[PDB]
Motif scaffolding. Structure first.
Motif: not given
Length: 229
Positions: A10-37
């Protein structure tokens, strides 16, 4: 006791700290939509409780390196759900059963080529400890008899899987997120009070930190507006 192993990998899990940091267009809020889908998609198929939480893991990883477009999030998110059923469940849904059940939403060939890209991007290591993996293991450790497990595993998973839709929980130990979701469930359906707040405090080790997770899980769960998709 498989909690130590769980706590380890569980410690071998990547500590993101930046949910989708590399994402240009799509943002944290496109994630909430997509995951609901994706959640609706995994429910429409009645796939293992581990398939959705695992696709979320895949998704936030894939997108933590490659780039996505608002127009491809569903392909990407569909592929993640495929990749996930293919590794957890015994009868891993096929690219076919996934194109026809979702009415040719994409061509049976596009997912094929999207799945692959993701496997490649993630270096063929799609595996993750999911909060889901802690329900049974923390159920007995919590002095809870195998008489209420069948109904406790359903509500706790539904809570967690609904809670994981929020970018909040997406920064927690799968262990904690499983505790707070396991708690918020025993709360709403009380047979006994919640003295387990201390009892769990030894498994995942923490006491004031094991409460915040509950406040975050339950707060996140109460945030499933299917009317956002």
């Amino acid at each position: 006791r498989v909690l130590n192993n769980l706590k380890l990998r569980e410690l071998l899990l990547p500590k993101f700290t930046s949910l989708w940091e590399i994402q240009t267009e799509v943002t944290v809020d496109n994630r909430t939509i997509l995951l609901t889908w994706m959640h609706l998609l995994c429910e429409s198929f009645e796939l293992d409780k581990s398939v959705f939480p695992l696709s979320v893991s895949i998704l936030d990883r894939y997108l933590c390196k490659k780039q996505g477009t608002k127009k491809t999030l569903q392909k990407i998110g569909a592929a993640c759900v495929l990749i996930g059923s293919k590794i957890r469940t015994v009868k891993p849904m096929t690219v076919s059963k996934l194109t026809y059940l979702s009415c040719d939403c994409f061509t049976n060939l596009e997912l094929i080529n999207q799945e692959k890209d993701i496997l490649e991007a993630l270096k063929w290591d799609t595996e993750a400890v999911l909060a889901t993996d802690f329900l049974i293991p923390l159920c007995n450790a919590l002095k809870i008899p195998e008489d209420l497990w069948p109904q406790l595993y359903e509500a706790a998973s539904t809570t967690i899987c609904k809670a994981l839709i929020q970018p909040n929980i997406a920064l927690l130990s799968p262990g904690l997120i499983c505790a707070g979701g396991l708690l918020t469930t025993i709360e709403t359906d009380n047979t006994n009070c919640r003295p387990w707040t201390c009892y769990l405090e030894d498994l995942s080790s923490i006491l004031n930190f094991s409460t915040n997770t509950v406040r975050t899980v339950k707060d996140q769960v109460s945030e499933a507006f299917s009317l956002y998709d």
